[PDB]
Amino acid sequence: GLDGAAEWPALRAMLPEVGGLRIVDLGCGFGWFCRWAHEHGASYVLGLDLSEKMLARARAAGPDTGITYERADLDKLHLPQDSFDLAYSSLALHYVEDVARLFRTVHQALSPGGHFVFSTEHPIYMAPARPGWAIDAEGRRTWPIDRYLVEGPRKTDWLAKGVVKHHRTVGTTLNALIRSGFAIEHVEEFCPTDAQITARPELAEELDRPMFLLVSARR
Amino acid sequence: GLDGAAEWPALRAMLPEVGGLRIVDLGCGFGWFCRWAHEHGASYVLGLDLSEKMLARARAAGPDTGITYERADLDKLHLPQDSFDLAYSSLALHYVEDVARLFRTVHQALSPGGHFVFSTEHPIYMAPARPGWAIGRRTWPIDRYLVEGPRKTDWLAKGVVKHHRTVGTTLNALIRSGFAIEHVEEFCPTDAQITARPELAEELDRPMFLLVSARR
């Protein structure tokens, strides 16, 4: 679960202290973060996902109190006003077409001083028409980029995953947060640590290009 | 000068109104911005550059009063506290090793509500040891994007070292130093700019510049 996600420690480090907080998890999946937050003292956790079957597995995994799971479409998201101290989302917002609308919804749902911490696929990773590694004449591993400044839907994971992602530059994402009422708190283009690479050698290639953008914003 | 810079209109659009402001230009070069700011009613303009010869050329370009040029190394910059309304810098910060220290100096130099607006080479552009295009479809291969530190691409030819920092590193350094991020632009020329200057079409594939505006 979380211990398998290379970017979890970096994203976890960006979170506020979760003890006593009211938290919403946007695109909670099996509820790995929901359970982590509850284990670390969250007063209340609302986990939202489109899949009823996945929410059924999340409920079954426990605990009996403090975590509520509800079916929701992040493209048509509604949240009660002034009801959360923290909004979290792992690798969901790159599938939302009107992300600015979602940001405004999260902003009104957060109490003053609350945070929104989320991960998305990095635009370097999402940009290319034919994403993948290239090995140059010298044997060096490279990541060819095209159309980085041409924003819009990308169908490069449509065949493999059945998803359309929305390519937006780092500036576009941050400007949308700012226009929505957030102050940018921390921005990280994920890089595994040398210790992570020693434990998981396959992470060495992640030094060449970022797969993920991690952002913390405050209202 | 400024008319030639494709990124100038985008950067100009990020500036506050300059009439009546005290402005510091970090890495002013020939003083194109200093003269522009003066012409648009800035009360005081301080242009700083490492090259005494370049400052002599800037001073000679005029006017007789309104702009002060002084030699400074941005790596060990001193600015008086609460003395400026706007700090501007065009394509200079990528030469600074300890940019967080510089940001702390700029923060304290700016009066409350002051602005800091700058352009730098984008880390996508700077990441490769030897940057360039690959080809039918044009691409920009990157490597070592997450490996921050000196880049020596133009060391032998020009005797300059640039400092590679990711977008997150740059923004976090500003935030930690006391600034609130106002606008971030990975500069993309407009369709009108690309029609007037066909060579600009390649900047749709990868950004050459990062533009940032912040408030303190």
With vertex at residue B185, the alpha carbon angle to CA B166 and CA A211, rounded to the nearest 5 degrees, is 40
**Which residue of chain B has the CA closest to A173?**
B184
Q: Alpha-carbon distance A157 to A155, whole Å?
A: 6
CA distances for A157 relative to A95, A165, A166, B41, B81, angstroms: 11, 8, 11, 53, 52
CA neighbours within 13 Å on the CB side: how many for A22?
A: 13
Tell me if B184 and A206 make a contact (CB, 8 A cut-off).
Answer: no
- From CA A129, how far away is CA B138, in angstroms rounded? 11
Residue of A167, A208, A216 for testing the chain B interface, max B β-carbons within 10 Å: A208
Phi-psi region of A197 (alpha: psi -120 to 50; beta: other; left: phi over 0): alpha
Measured between beta carbons, the chain A residues lying within 8 angstroms of B137 are 129-130, 146
Pair B149, B165: CB distance under 8 Å: no
Cβ neighbours of A203 in B, within 8 Å: none
CA distance A136 to B187: 27
All domains of chain B, ordered by start, with CATH? 1-216 (3.40.50.150)
Name the token pair of B122.
């984008």
The pairing of beta strand A84-90 with beta strand A110-121 = parallel
Number of other residues whose CB lies within 10 A of the CB of residue B34:
27
With CB atoms and an 8 Å threshold, state whether B172 touches A183: no
Q: Does the beta-carbon distance from A170 to B147 stay under 8 Å? A: no
**Smallest Cα distance from B109 to chain A, Å:** 22
Phi/psi for A127 (5° steps) reads: -55, -50
Chain B residues with CB under 8 Å of A174 CB are 171, 181, 184
Closest by Cβ to B143, choosing from A142, A149, A214: A142
Q: Rounded to the nearest 5°, which phi and psi values hold at A7?
A: -85, -5
Nearest to A36 by CA among A2, A65, A85, A13: A2
Query: Contacts of residue A206 in chain B, CB cutoff 8 Å?
Result: 146
Rounded Cα distance, B193 and B206, in Å: 16
**Chain B closest CA to A161's CA: distance in Å?**
25
Question: Using alpha carbons only, how large is chain A's radius of gyration in Å?
Answer: 18
Asked if residue B122 lies in contact with residue B208, where contact means CB atoms within 8 angstroms, the answer is yes
Of A130, A144, A178, the CB nearest to B141: A144
Residue at A195: amino acid letter:
A
Paired tokens of A89: 């989302």
The structure's method of determination equals X-ray
Closest CA to A186 of B216, B171, B116: B171
Q: Which residues contact A56 (CB under 8 A, 6 or more apart)?
A: none
Residues B164/B157, Cβ–Cβ less than 8 Å: no
Inter-chain touch B143–A208, beta carbons under 8 Å = yes
Structure tokens at A37: 């937050």
Specify burial of residue A79 (Cβ count, 10 A radius: 0-12, 13-18, 19+): buried
Encoded amino acid at B36, one letter: W
- B171 with A185: Cβ contact below 8 A: no
Contact A178 B182 (CB under 8 A): yes
The Cα–Cα gap between A123 and A152 comes to 11
C-alpha A119 chain-centroid distance? 3
Measured in whole angstroms, the distance separating CA B180 from the mean position of its chain's CA atoms is 18
Q: How many CB pairs under 8 A join A and B?
A: 112
Question: How far apart (Å, rounded) are the C-alpha atoms in residues B186 and B212?
Answer: 9
Sign of CA dihedral B49, B54, B56, B59: negative
Residue A101: Cβ within 10 Å count:
16
Closest Cα in chain A, distance from residue B168 (Å): 5
Q: Rounded to whole angstroms, how far apart are CA atoms B109 and B95?
A: 21
**Cβ distance of A149 and B184 shorter than 8 Å:** no
Among B142, B146, B203, whose Cβ lies nearest the Cβ of A149? Answer: B203
Q: For residues B165 and B150, what is the distance between their CA atoms, to the nearest angstrom?
A: 9
Contact B48, B27 (CB under 8 A): yes
Is A118:A10 a contact under the CB 8 Å cutoff? Answer: no
Chain A residues close to B122, C-beta within 8 Å? none
Q: Among A142, A169, A189, select the one facing B141 at the smallest CB separation.
A: A142
Q: Are the beta carbons of A152 and A166 closer than 8 angstroms?
A: yes
Give the SS3 label for residue B45: strand
